[PDB]
Protein backbone atom coordinates (compact mmCIF):
# COMPACT_ATOMS: atom_id res chain seq x y z
CA UNK A 1 0.00 0.00 0.00
CA UNK A 2 1.17 3.74 -0.46
CA UNK A 3 3.29 4.20 2.47
CA UNK A 4 4.66 7.54 3.71
CA UNK A 5 8.10 7.74 3.91
CA UNK A 6 8.30 9.00 8.08
CA UNK A 7 6.59 5.00 8.30
CA UNK A 8 9.02 2.93 6.06
CA UNK A 9 12.16 4.91 7.36
CA UNK A 10 11.03 5.04 10.68
CA UNK A 11 11.35 0.96 10.83
CA UNK A 12 14.09 1.17 9.09
CA UNK A 13 15.80 3.28 12.08
CA UNK A 14 14.00 0.97 14.23
CA UNK A 15 15.73 -2.47 13.18
CA UNK A 16 18.48 -0.60 11.08
CA UNK A 17 18.55 -0.96 7.89
CA UNK A 18 18.13 0.79 5.08
CA UNK A 19 15.39 0.60 2.20
CA UNK A 20 16.89 2.09 -1.16
CA UNK A 21 15.56 4.49 -3.22
CA UNK A 22 15.22 3.98 -6.76
CA UNK A 23 14.73 6.19 -9.77
CA UNK A 24 12.21 5.78 -12.33
CA UNK A 25 11.17 7.28 -15.41
CA UNK A 26 9.22 4.78 -17.33
CA UNK A 27 7.27 1.73 -17.00
CA UNK A 28 10.36 -1.14 -17.49
CA UNK A 29 12.42 0.92 -14.24
CA UNK A 30 9.36 0.65 -12.64
CA UNK A 31 8.89 -2.99 -13.32
CA UNK A 32 12.59 -4.45 -13.24
CA UNK A 33 12.57 -2.64 -9.41
CA UNK A 34 8.89 -3.90 -8.38
CA UNK A 35 10.27 -7.28 -9.70
CA UNK A 36 13.19 -7.31 -6.95
CA UNK A 37 11.29 -5.95 -3.99
CA UNK A 38 8.68 -8.37 -4.27
CA UNK A 39 11.12 -11.55 -4.72
CA UNK A 40 13.18 -9.99 -1.85
CA UNK A 41 9.66 -9.54 0.37
CA UNK A 42 11.17 -5.72 0.72
CA UNK A 43 9.57 -2.47 1.41
CA UNK A 44 10.36 0.25 -1.46
CA UNK A 45 10.58 3.92 -2.36
CA UNK A 46 9.80 4.75 -5.86
CA UNK A 47 11.26 8.02 -6.62
CA UNK A 48 11.14 10.66 -9.36
CA UNK A 49 13.17 13.62 -10.16
CA UNK A 50 11.58 17.01 -11.64
CA UNK A 51 13.64 15.89 -14.38
CA UNK A 52 11.89 12.57 -14.73
CA UNK A 53 8.18 14.12 -14.10
CA UNK A 54 9.35 16.25 -17.17
CA UNK A 55 9.82 13.06 -19.40
CA UNK A 56 6.72 11.21 -18.44
CA UNK A 57 4.67 14.45 -18.74
CA UNK A 58 3.67 13.83 -15.09
CA UNK A 59 0.27 12.05 -16.05
CA UNK A 60 2.50 8.65 -17.45
CA UNK A 61 4.43 8.31 -14.21
CA UNK A 62 1.44 9.05 -12.01
CA UNK A 63 -0.61 6.16 -13.73
CA UNK A 64 2.27 3.42 -13.61
CA UNK A 65 2.78 4.49 -10.20
CA UNK A 66 -0.49 3.37 -9.00
CA UNK A 67 -0.06 0.09 -11.15
CA UNK A 68 2.70 -0.65 -9.01
CA UNK A 69 0.35 0.14 -6.25
CA UNK A 70 -2.28 -2.17 -7.22
CA UNK A 71 -0.53 -4.56 -8.89
CA UNK A 72 1.90 -5.16 -5.53
CA UNK A 73 -0.88 -3.91 -2.90
CA UNK A 74 0.42 -5.84 0.48
CA UNK A 75 4.20 -4.42 -0.53
CA UNK A 76 4.71 -1.28 1.57
CA UNK A 77 5.49 1.58 -1.66
CA UNK A 78 6.09 5.33 -1.18
CA UNK A 79 6.24 7.55 -4.25
CA UNK A 80 8.88 10.12 -3.26
CA UNK A 81 9.85 13.50 -5.40
CA UNK A 82 13.39 13.77 -5.38
CA UNK A 83 15.16 17.03 -5.44
CA UNK A 84 12.18 19.56 -5.65
CA UNK A 85 12.99 22.68 -5.93
CA UNK A 86 10.35 24.93 -4.95
CA UNK A 87 6.92 24.63 -3.45
CA UNK A 88 4.91 24.65 -6.64
CA UNK A 89 7.42 21.23 -7.31
CA UNK A 90 6.07 19.36 -4.42
CA UNK A 91 2.89 20.70 -4.55
CA UNK A 92 2.71 19.44 -8.35
CA UNK A 93 4.08 15.98 -6.82
CA UNK A 94 1.69 15.61 -4.09
CA UNK A 95 -1.42 16.35 -6.37
CA UNK A 96 -0.23 13.37 -8.59
CA UNK A 97 -0.96 11.47 -5.30
CA UNK A 98 2.87 11.22 -4.12
CA UNK A 99 3.50 10.29 -0.88
CA UNK A 100 6.54 11.84 -0.25
CA UNK A 101 8.75 14.96 -1.06
CA UNK A 102 12.60 15.89 -1.19
CA UNK A 103 12.73 19.95 -0.68
CA UNK A 104 16.26 20.67 -1.91
CA UNK A 105 17.39 23.68 -0.86
CA UNK A 106 20.75 22.70 0.03
CA UNK A 107 22.72 25.48 -2.37
CA UNK A 108 21.15 28.28 0.37
CA UNK A 109 22.40 29.55 3.01
CA UNK A 110 21.09 27.65 6.66
CA UNK A 111 18.28 30.53 7.18
CA UNK A 112 16.91 31.04 3.85
CA UNK A 113 17.29 26.70 3.06
CA UNK A 114 15.52 26.34 6.87
CA UNK A 115 13.11 28.83 5.43
CA UNK A 116 12.35 27.12 2.08
CA UNK A 117 11.60 23.73 3.84
CA UNK A 118 9.88 25.47 6.32
CA UNK A 119 7.56 26.10 3.80
CA UNK A 120 7.12 22.68 2.11
CA UNK A 121 7.02 21.26 5.39
CA UNK A 122 3.54 23.13 6.18
CA UNK A 123 2.07 22.28 2.94
CA UNK A 124 3.42 18.68 2.99
CA UNK A 125 2.23 17.36 6.90
CA UNK A 126 -0.79 19.40 6.09
CA UNK A 127 -1.61 16.31 3.98
CA UNK A 128 0.31 13.47 5.77
CA UNK A 129 2.91 13.80 3.18
CA UNK A 130 6.46 12.87 4.30
CA UNK A 131 9.43 15.82 3.93
CA UNK A 132 13.26 15.24 3.16
CA UNK A 133 15.03 18.37 3.09
CA UNK A 134 19.13 18.42 2.89
CA UNK A 135 21.81 20.30 4.42
CA UNK A 136 25.01 21.44 2.96
CA UNK A 137 30.32 18.11 4.66
CA UNK A 138 27.48 18.52 7.07
CA UNK A 139 28.20 19.81 10.36
CA UNK A 140 26.07 18.05 13.35
CA UNK A 141 25.10 20.35 15.47
CA UNK A 142 23.78 22.35 12.25
CA UNK A 143 21.95 19.36 11.64
CA UNK A 144 20.39 19.34 15.10
CA UNK A 145 19.89 22.84 14.56
CA UNK A 146 17.98 22.41 11.00
CA UNK A 147 15.82 19.59 12.02
CA UNK A 148 15.01 21.46 15.40
CA UNK A 149 13.28 24.43 12.91
CA UNK A 150 11.91 22.47 9.77
CA UNK A 151 10.60 19.40 11.27
CA UNK A 152 11.45 17.44 8.55
CA UNK A 153 11.26 13.32 8.50
CA UNK A 154 14.50 12.69 6.49
CA UNK A 155 17.34 14.28 5.77
CA UNK A 156 19.77 13.72 3.54
CA UNK A 157 23.27 14.19 4.93
CA UNK A 158 26.79 15.16 3.05
CA UNK A 159 29.31 12.52 4.00
CA UNK A 160 31.62 12.65 0.65
CA UNK A 161 29.08 11.42 -1.95
CA UNK A 162 27.69 12.10 -5.33
CA UNK A 163 26.09 11.97 -8.07
CA UNK A 164 26.33 9.86 -11.75
CA UNK A 165 29.21 7.31 -12.59
CA UNK A 166 35.75 6.37 1.67
CA UNK A 167 33.17 8.58 3.76
CA UNK A 168 32.46 10.01 6.48
CA UNK A 169 30.60 6.90 8.45
CA UNK A 170 32.27 9.22 12.03
CA UNK A 171 30.04 11.88 11.26
CA UNK A 172 26.68 9.61 10.62
CA UNK A 173 26.13 8.62 14.30
CA UNK A 174 27.18 11.62 15.34
CA UNK A 175 24.30 13.10 12.93
CA UNK A 176 21.80 10.38 13.56
CA UNK A 177 21.88 10.98 17.21
CA UNK A 178 22.24 14.63 17.36
CA UNK A 179 19.24 14.87 15.41
CA UNK A 180 17.00 11.19 16.02
CA UNK A 181 15.64 11.01 13.02
CA UNK A 182 16.01 8.77 9.65
CA UNK A 183 19.15 10.09 7.84
CA UNK A 184 19.29 9.93 3.55
CA UNK A 185 22.58 9.10 1.32
CA UNK A 186 21.88 10.36 -2.08
CA UNK A 187 24.94 9.44 -4.66
CA UNK A 188 24.71 6.16 -3.34
CA UNK A 189 25.25 3.71 -6.61
CA UNK A 190 28.11 1.12 -6.39
CA UNK A 191 29.11 1.21 -10.28
CA UNK A 192 28.81 -2.69 -10.38
CA UNK A 193 31.97 -4.06 -12.27
CA UNK A 194 29.10 -6.55 -14.03
CA UNK A 195 27.09 -3.68 -15.25
CA UNK A 196 30.58 -1.27 -16.50
CA UNK A 197 32.07 -4.05 -18.05
CA UNK A 198 29.36 -5.35 -20.00
CA UNK A 199 28.39 -1.73 -21.43
CA UNK A 200 32.03 -1.28 -22.77
CA UNK A 201 32.48 -4.32 -23.59
CA UNK A 202 29.53 -3.99 -26.15
CA UNK A 203 29.90 -0.70 -27.84
CA UNK A 204 29.74 2.08 -25.00
CA UNK A 205 32.04 4.22 -23.47
CA UNK A 206 32.21 4.38 -19.45
CA UNK A 207 36.17 3.82 -18.89
CA UNK A 208 36.19 5.79 -15.40
CA UNK A 209 33.26 4.70 -13.67
CA UNK A 210 33.25 4.35 -9.97
CA UNK A 211 31.01 4.24 -7.17
CA UNK A 212 30.37 4.11 -3.56
CA UNK A 213 31.71 0.70 -2.34
CA UNK A 214 28.23 -1.21 -1.22
CA UNK A 215 30.61 -2.20 2.56
CA UNK A 216 30.34 1.51 2.69
CA UNK A 217 27.07 2.07 2.28
CA UNK A 218 26.26 -0.81 5.11
CA UNK A 219 28.69 0.67 7.72
CA UNK A 220 26.54 3.89 7.03
CA UNK A 221 22.86 1.91 7.63
CA UNK A 222 24.59 1.13 11.45
CA UNK A 223 25.58 4.22 11.75
CA UNK A 224 22.08 5.52 11.18
CA UNK A 225 21.41 5.78 7.43
CA UNK A 226 17.78 5.04 6.84
CA UNK A 227 17.55 5.50 2.65
CA UNK A 228 19.67 4.84 -0.01
CA UNK A 229 19.51 6.88 -2.89
CA UNK A 230 20.42 4.87 -6.48
CA UNK A 231 20.02 5.92 -9.71
CA UNK A 232 23.30 5.48 -11.69
CA UNK A 233 23.17 1.79 -11.67
CA UNK A 234 19.77 0.80 -12.94
CA UNK A 235 20.29 3.27 -15.98
CA UNK A 236 23.80 1.33 -16.56
CA UNK A 237 22.45 -1.70 -16.36
CA UNK A 238 19.48 -1.04 -18.65
CA UNK A 239 22.03 0.31 -21.32
CA UNK A 240 24.20 -2.85 -21.44
CA UNK A 241 21.70 -5.03 -21.00
CA UNK A 242 20.35 -3.57 -24.95
CA UNK A 243 24.19 -2.58 -26.10
CA UNK A 244 24.50 -6.22 -25.74
CA UNK A 245 21.19 -7.53 -27.56
CA UNK A 246 22.03 -5.12 -30.51
CA UNK A 247 25.94 -6.75 -31.09
CA UNK A 248 24.67 -10.15 -30.55
CA UNK A 249 21.23 -9.69 -32.54
CA UNK A 250 21.50 -7.07 -34.88
CA UNK A 251 18.24 -7.83 -36.88
CA UNK A 252 16.48 -7.42 -33.58
CA UNK A 253 14.30 -4.62 -34.04
CA UNK A 254 11.47 -5.40 -31.81
CA UNK A 255 12.11 -2.81 -28.28
CA UNK A 256 10.37 -5.89 -26.56
CA UNK A 257 13.51 -7.99 -27.36
CA UNK A 258 15.87 -5.51 -25.97
CA UNK A 259 14.35 -3.57 -23.02
CA UNK A 260 12.90 -6.56 -21.85
CA UNK A 261 16.52 -8.15 -21.14
CA UNK A 262 17.03 -3.93 -19.99
CA UNK A 263 14.16 -4.66 -17.54
CA UNK A 264 15.59 -7.99 -15.99
CA UNK A 265 19.05 -6.27 -15.94
CA UNK A 266 17.85 -3.55 -13.29
CA UNK A 267 16.04 -6.69 -10.67
CA UNK A 268 19.16 -8.79 -11.33
CA UNK A 269 21.25 -5.79 -9.97
CA UNK A 270 19.41 -5.10 -7.47
CA UNK A 271 18.61 -7.94 -5.65
CA UNK A 272 22.08 -7.92 -3.68
CA UNK A 273 21.98 -4.50 -2.95
CA UNK A 274 18.49 -4.69 -1.16
CA UNK A 275 19.69 -7.85 0.47
CA UNK A 276 22.71 -6.01 1.64
CA UNK A 277 20.36 -3.32 2.46
CA UNK A 278 18.92 -4.74 5.20
CA UNK A 279 14.73 -4.68 3.93
CA UNK A 280 14.27 -7.91 2.44
CA UNK A 281 12.04 -9.61 3.75
CA UNK A 282 10.73 -6.53 5.64
CA UNK A 283 7.30 -6.04 3.68
CA UNK A 284 4.97 -7.71 6.26
CA UNK A 285 6.32 -5.87 9.64
CA UNK A 286 3.65 -3.44 9.57
CA UNK A 287 0.15 -1.60 8.79
CA UNK A 288 0.59 1.38 6.36
CA UNK A 289 -0.85 4.28 7.85
CA UNK A 290 -2.66 6.74 5.16
CA UNK A 291 -1.87 9.83 4.65
CA UNK A 292 -5.19 10.57 5.96
CA UNK A 293 -5.05 9.13 8.68
CA UNK A 294 -1.07 10.35 8.99
CA UNK A 295 -2.08 13.41 9.11
CA UNK A 296 -2.50 13.14 12.88
CA UNK A 297 0.93 12.64 13.02
CA UNK A 298 1.44 16.69 13.20
CA UNK B 1 -12.71 11.13 -24.65
CA UNK B 2 -12.57 7.00 -25.07
CA UNK B 3 -13.98 6.09 -28.41
CA UNK B 4 -15.49 3.34 -29.97
CA UNK B 5 -13.68 1.57 -33.04
CA UNK B 6 -18.05 2.11 -34.86
CA UNK B 7 -18.04 5.42 -34.34
CA UNK B 8 -14.82 6.71 -35.45
CA UNK B 9 -14.96 4.42 -38.14
CA UNK B 10 -17.98 4.46 -39.34
CA UNK B 11 -16.79 8.84 -39.60
CA UNK B 12 -13.95 8.42 -41.32
CA UNK B 13 -16.10 5.62 -44.17
CA UNK B 14 -18.11 9.00 -44.30
CA UNK B 15 -15.42 11.06 -45.35
CA UNK B 16 -13.26 8.78 -47.20
CA UNK B 17 -10.34 9.14 -45.03
CA UNK B 18 -8.64 6.38 -42.58
CA UNK B 19 -7.54 6.54 -38.88
CA UNK B 20 -5.00 4.16 -38.27
CA UNK B 21 -4.37 2.05 -35.43
CA UNK B 22 -0.36 2.16 -33.74
CA UNK B 23 0.49 -1.01 -31.54
CA UNK B 24 1.71 0.04 -27.90
CA UNK B 25 3.55 -1.81 -25.27
CA UNK B 26 4.96 0.98 -23.21
CA UNK B 27 5.13 4.42 -21.99
CA UNK B 28 7.30 5.62 -25.07
CA UNK B 29 5.79 4.55 -27.96
CA UNK B 30 2.29 5.34 -26.52
CA UNK B 31 3.86 8.97 -26.22
CA UNK B 32 5.28 9.27 -29.87
CA UNK B 33 1.86 8.73 -31.06
CA UNK B 34 0.29 10.98 -29.60
CA UNK B 35 2.47 13.81 -29.96
CA UNK B 36 1.65 12.97 -33.67
CA UNK B 37 -1.80 12.69 -33.62
CA UNK B 38 -2.51 16.09 -31.23
CA UNK B 39 -0.12 17.92 -33.43
CA UNK B 40 -2.54 16.89 -36.80
CA UNK B 41 -5.76 16.92 -34.24
CA UNK B 42 -6.28 13.10 -35.73
CA UNK B 43 -8.45 10.74 -34.08
CA UNK B 44 -6.20 7.61 -33.23
CA UNK B 45 -6.47 3.98 -32.30
CA UNK B 46 -4.42 2.31 -29.79
CA UNK B 47 -3.55 -0.91 -29.95
CA UNK B 48 -2.23 -3.47 -27.61
CA UNK B 49 -2.20 -7.35 -28.37
CA UNK B 50 -2.12 -9.95 -25.87
CA UNK B 51 1.97 -10.08 -26.16
CA UNK B 52 1.68 -6.38 -25.43
CA UNK B 53 -0.52 -6.62 -21.87
CA UNK B 54 1.37 -9.80 -21.18
CA UNK B 55 4.83 -7.51 -21.72
CA UNK B 56 3.31 -4.68 -19.15
CA UNK B 57 1.48 -7.67 -17.42
CA UNK B 58 -1.73 -5.81 -18.41
CA UNK B 59 -2.66 -2.93 -15.50
CA UNK B 60 0.71 -0.74 -16.73
CA UNK B 61 -0.56 -0.52 -20.13
CA UNK B 62 -4.42 0.03 -18.81
CA UNK B 63 -2.69 2.92 -16.78
CA UNK B 64 -1.10 4.48 -19.84
CA UNK B 65 -4.03 4.48 -22.01
CA UNK B 66 -6.19 5.98 -19.30
CA UNK B 67 -3.08 8.78 -19.12
CA UNK B 68 -3.72 9.53 -22.60
CA UNK B 69 -7.04 9.59 -22.29
CA UNK B 70 -6.96 12.01 -19.56
CA UNK B 71 -3.92 14.40 -20.90
CA UNK B 72 -5.44 14.88 -24.28
CA UNK B 73 -9.38 15.08 -23.33
CA UNK B 74 -10.29 16.57 -26.46
CA UNK B 75 -8.83 13.96 -29.10
CA UNK B 76 -11.54 10.83 -29.37
CA UNK B 77 -8.96 7.94 -28.31
CA UNK B 78 -9.78 4.36 -29.45
CA UNK B 79 -8.63 1.86 -27.11
CA UNK B 80 -8.33 -1.42 -28.93
CA UNK B 81 -7.74 -5.48 -28.28
CA UNK B 82 -5.70 -6.32 -31.60
CA UNK B 83 -5.49 -10.45 -32.88
CA UNK B 84 -7.69 -11.47 -29.25
CA UNK B 85 -8.04 -15.48 -29.64
CA UNK B 86 -10.64 -16.18 -26.92
CA UNK B 87 -13.58 -14.86 -25.29
CA UNK B 88 -11.30 -14.47 -22.13
CA UNK B 89 -9.55 -12.24 -23.87
CA UNK B 90 -11.88 -9.62 -24.64
CA UNK B 91 -13.41 -10.13 -21.30
CA UNK B 92 -10.27 -9.38 -20.00
CA UNK B 93 -9.59 -6.20 -22.51
CA UNK B 94 -13.00 -5.24 -21.58
CA UNK B 95 -12.34 -5.40 -18.08
CA UNK B 96 -9.10 -2.93 -18.82
CA UNK B 97 -11.80 -0.63 -20.36
CA UNK B 98 -11.05 -1.38 -23.86
CA UNK B 99 -13.71 0.07 -26.10
CA UNK B 100 -12.81 -2.45 -28.78
CA UNK B 101 -11.58 -5.89 -30.04
CA UNK B 102 -10.19 -7.89 -32.60
CA UNK B 103 -11.33 -11.91 -32.59
CA UNK B 104 -9.40 -12.90 -35.58
CA UNK B 105 -10.16 -16.20 -35.74
CA UNK B 106 -9.10 -16.00 -39.39
CA UNK B 107 -7.49 -19.08 -39.68
CA UNK B 108 -10.38 -21.69 -38.74
CA UNK B 109 -12.88 -22.48 -41.45
CA UNK B 110 -15.61 -20.13 -41.91
CA UNK B 111 -17.88 -21.68 -39.67
CA UNK B 112 -15.56 -21.90 -36.48
CA UNK B 113 -14.24 -18.19 -37.51
CA UNK B 114 -18.26 -17.10 -37.54
CA UNK B 115 -19.13 -19.30 -33.87
CA UNK B 116 -16.00 -17.74 -32.62
CA UNK B 117 -17.01 -14.24 -33.80
CA UNK B 118 -20.14 -14.46 -32.92
CA UNK B 119 -20.03 -15.53 -29.30
CA UNK B 120 -17.61 -12.42 -28.94
CA UNK B 121 -19.67 -9.77 -31.05
CA UNK B 122 -22.52 -10.80 -28.11
CA UNK B 123 -20.14 -10.26 -25.04
CA UNK B 124 -18.70 -7.00 -26.59
CA UNK B 125 -21.75 -5.62 -27.81
CA UNK B 126 -24.00 -6.30 -24.64
CA UNK B 127 -22.08 -3.00 -23.27
CA UNK B 128 -20.96 -0.98 -26.50
CA UNK B 129 -17.59 -2.45 -27.16
CA UNK B 130 -16.86 -2.87 -31.00
CA UNK B 131 -15.90 -5.67 -32.96
CA UNK B 132 -13.75 -6.13 -35.66
CA UNK B 133 -12.55 -10.00 -36.96
CA UNK B 134 -10.92 -11.25 -40.20
CA UNK B 135 -11.68 -13.60 -43.12
CA UNK B 136 -8.46 -14.63 -44.61
CA UNK B 137 -1.30 -13.16 -46.75
CA UNK B 138 0.91 -11.54 -50.02
CA UNK B 139 -0.13 -12.24 -53.29
CA UNK B 140 -2.46 -13.78 -51.57
CA UNK B 141 -5.56 -16.21 -53.06
CA UNK B 142 -7.32 -13.37 -51.37
CA UNK B 143 -10.90 -12.96 -50.04
CA UNK B 144 -13.90 -13.73 -51.83
CA UNK B 145 -16.38 -10.76 -51.87
CA UNK B 146 -19.64 -12.89 -51.63
CA UNK B 147 -18.21 -14.49 -48.33
CA UNK B 148 -17.66 -11.40 -46.56
CA UNK B 149 -20.84 -9.96 -46.80
CA UNK B 150 -22.39 -13.71 -45.44
CA UNK B 151 -19.62 -13.60 -42.70
CA UNK B 152 -21.01 -9.89 -41.77
CA UNK B 153 -24.54 -10.79 -41.91
CA UNK B 154 -24.05 -13.29 -40.10
CA UNK B 155 -21.87 -11.72 -37.25
CA UNK B 156 -22.74 -8.17 -37.51
CA UNK B 157 -18.77 -7.42 -36.91
CA UNK B 158 -18.29 -3.54 -36.70
CA UNK B 159 -15.37 -3.59 -39.24
CA UNK B 160 -13.98 -6.17 -40.93
CA UNK B 161 -9.93 -6.78 -42.00
CA UNK B 162 -9.57 -8.95 -45.93
CA UNK B 163 -6.58 -10.08 -47.27
CA UNK B 164 -5.51 -8.02 -50.26
CA UNK B 165 -2.07 -8.62 -50.68
CA UNK B 166 -1.18 -7.50 -47.21
CA UNK B 167 1.25 -9.65 -44.80
CA UNK B 168 2.44 -8.76 -41.23
CA UNK B 169 6.31 -8.15 -41.03
CA UNK B 170 8.98 -6.04 -42.06
CA UNK B 171 9.95 -8.66 -44.77
CA UNK B 172 6.46 -8.14 -46.86
CA UNK B 173 7.67 -8.80 -50.52
CA UNK B 174 4.35 -4.91 -56.40
CA UNK B 175 0.74 -3.85 -55.83
CA UNK B 176 -2.41 -4.68 -53.75
CA UNK B 177 -5.86 -6.09 -54.76
CA UNK B 178 -7.54 -2.76 -54.40
CA UNK B 179 -10.15 -3.78 -56.86
CA UNK B 180 -11.27 -6.61 -54.19
CA UNK B 181 -11.36 -3.68 -51.44
CA UNK B 182 -14.11 -1.61 -53.48
CA UNK B 183 -16.61 -4.13 -53.83
CA UNK B 184 -16.06 -5.63 -50.21
CA UNK B 185 -16.65 -2.14 -48.78
CA UNK B 186 -20.04 -1.68 -50.89
CA UNK B 187 -21.09 -5.61 -50.41
CA UNK B 188 -21.21 -5.19 -46.81
CA UNK B 189 -21.12 -1.96 -46.06
CA UNK B 190 -19.36 -2.02 -43.14
CA UNK B 191 -15.19 -0.15 -42.58
CA UNK B 192 -12.77 -2.37 -43.77
CA UNK B 193 -9.15 -2.82 -42.09
CA UNK B 194 -5.85 -3.35 -43.17
CA UNK B 195 -3.49 -5.60 -41.40
CA UNK B 196 -0.12 -5.54 -42.14
CA UNK B 197 -0.03 -1.98 -43.64
CA UNK B 198 3.73 -0.72 -42.23
CA UNK B 199 5.58 0.60 -45.13
CA UNK B 200 9.46 0.67 -43.87
CA UNK B 201 10.39 4.00 -44.73
CA UNK B 202 13.01 4.57 -46.49
CA UNK B 203 14.51 7.10 -43.63
CA UNK B 204 13.74 4.29 -40.62
CA UNK B 205 15.34 1.57 -42.56
CA UNK B 206 18.06 3.29 -43.62
CA UNK B 207 19.19 4.16 -39.75
CA UNK B 208 19.20 0.65 -38.98
CA UNK B 209 21.60 -0.17 -41.12
CA UNK B 210 23.94 2.39 -40.56
CA UNK B 211 24.07 2.07 -36.98
CA UNK B 212 24.64 -1.72 -36.62
CA UNK B 213 21.65 -3.21 -37.74
CA UNK B 214 20.55 -6.06 -40.00
CA UNK B 215 17.81 -6.07 -41.79
CA UNK B 216 18.98 -5.61 -45.69
CA UNK B 217 15.80 -7.08 -47.41
CA UNK B 218 12.97 -5.09 -46.01
CA UNK B 219 9.95 -3.88 -47.52
CA UNK B 220 6.19 -2.33 -46.24
CA UNK B 221 3.28 -1.30 -48.54
CA UNK B 222 3.56 1.60 -50.00
CA UNK B 223 1.89 4.76 -48.88
CA UNK B 224 0.16 5.22 -51.69
CA UNK B 225 -1.23 1.95 -52.19
CA UNK B 226 -2.48 2.81 -48.96
CA UNK B 227 -3.98 6.03 -50.03
CA UNK B 228 -5.81 3.95 -52.59
CA UNK B 229 -7.70 1.27 -50.50
CA UNK B 230 -8.43 4.04 -47.87
CA UNK B 231 -10.31 5.77 -51.21
CA UNK B 232 -11.81 2.01 -52.00
CA UNK B 233 -13.26 1.57 -48.50
CA UNK B 234 -10.65 1.40 -46.20
CA UNK B 235 -11.10 3.23 -42.88
CA UNK B 236 -8.26 1.46 -40.42
CA UNK B 237 -4.52 0.96 -40.71
CA UNK B 238 -2.96 -1.04 -38.92
CA UNK B 239 0.37 0.02 -38.28
CA UNK B 240 3.58 -1.72 -35.93
CA UNK B 241 6.60 -2.81 -37.31
CA UNK B 242 7.00 0.73 -38.74
CA UNK B 243 6.75 2.16 -34.74
CA UNK B 244 9.43 -0.54 -33.32
CA UNK B 245 11.59 0.41 -36.14
CA UNK B 246 11.69 4.01 -36.16
CA UNK B 247 12.50 3.53 -32.47
CA UNK B 248 15.10 0.97 -32.68
CA UNK B 249 16.77 3.46 -35.07
CA UNK B 250 17.12 6.33 -33.04
CA UNK B 251 18.66 4.22 -30.14
CA UNK B 252 21.11 2.40 -32.56
CA UNK B 253 21.77 5.78 -33.62
CA UNK B 254 22.62 7.23 -30.11
CA UNK B 255 24.80 4.21 -29.05
CA UNK B 256 27.25 5.21 -31.92
CA UNK B 257 27.43 8.56 -32.01
CA UNK B 258 27.36 9.05 -27.95
CA UNK B 259 28.76 5.49 -26.80
CA UNK B 260 29.26 7.30 -23.28
CA UNK B 261 25.62 7.55 -23.16
CA UNK B 262 23.74 5.63 -19.99
CA UNK B 263 20.86 7.37 -19.16
CA UNK B 264 18.03 5.66 -21.13
CA UNK B 265 16.23 9.01 -21.49
CA UNK B 266 19.04 9.83 -23.91
CA UNK B 267 18.04 6.61 -26.59
CA UNK B 268 14.26 6.11 -25.49
CA UNK B 269 13.64 9.81 -25.80
CA UNK B 270 14.49 10.03 -29.47
CA UNK B 271 13.11 6.70 -30.58
CA UNK B 272 10.33 8.27 -28.87
CA UNK B 273 10.68 11.49 -31.21
CA UNK B 274 11.37 9.28 -34.10
CA UNK B 275 8.19 7.81 -33.79
CA UNK B 276 6.30 10.86 -34.20
CA UNK B 277 8.34 11.92 -36.80
CA UNK B 278 7.54 9.22 -38.74
CA UNK B 279 3.72 9.32 -38.23
CA UNK B 280 3.41 12.75 -39.13
CA UNK B 281 3.69 12.17 -42.43
CA UNK B 282 1.57 8.81 -42.18
CA UNK B 283 -1.21 10.20 -41.11
CA UNK B 284 -1.88 13.04 -43.17
CA UNK B 285 -1.49 10.83 -46.26
CA UNK B 286 -4.12 8.76 -44.31
CA UNK B 287 -6.29 11.55 -44.76
CA UNK B 288 -6.86 11.85 -41.08
CA UNK B 289 -5.63 15.59 -39.68
CA UNK B 290 -7.79 17.94 -38.38
CA UNK B 291 -10.75 15.14 -37.92
CA UNK B 292 -10.71 15.13 -34.21
CA UNK B 293 -12.91 18.06 -34.06
CA UNK B 294 -15.74 16.25 -36.06
CA UNK B 295 -17.88 14.42 -34.00
CA UNK B 296 -18.64 13.95 -30.76
CA UNK B 297 -17.60 10.77 -28.66
CA UNK B 298 -20.60 8.23 -27.50
CA UNK B 299 -19.53 6.26 -24.51
CA UNK B 300 -19.82 2.90 -24.29
CA UNK B 301 -23.43 3.03 -21.59
CA UNK B 302 -24.90 5.16 -25.01
CA UNK B 303 -23.55 3.04 -27.78
CA UNK B 304 -25.12 0.15 -25.98
CA UNK B 305 -28.07 1.39 -27.50
CA UNK B 306 -27.36 1.00 -31.42
CA UNK B 307 -27.06 -3.02 -31.32
ZN1 LIG C 1 20.29 12.97 -5.14
ZN1 LIG D 1 -2.08 -7.63 -37.75
Same mark, same amino acid.
Given at each position: ????????????????????????????????????????????????????????????????????????????????????????????????????? #?? +? =???? @????? !????? $?? /????????????????????????????????????????????????????????????????????????????????????? #?? +? =???? @????? !????? $?? /??????????????????????????????????????????????????????????????????????????
Amino acid at each position: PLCTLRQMLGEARKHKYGVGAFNVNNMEQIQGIMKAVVQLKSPVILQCSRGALKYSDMIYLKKLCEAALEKHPDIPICIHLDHGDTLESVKMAIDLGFSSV #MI +D =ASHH @PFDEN !VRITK $EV /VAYAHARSVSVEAELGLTEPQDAKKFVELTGVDALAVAIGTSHGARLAIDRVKTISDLTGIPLVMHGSSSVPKDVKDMINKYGGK #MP +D =AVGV @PIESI !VHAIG $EG /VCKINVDSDSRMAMTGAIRKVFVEHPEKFDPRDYLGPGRDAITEMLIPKIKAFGSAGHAGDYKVVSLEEAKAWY
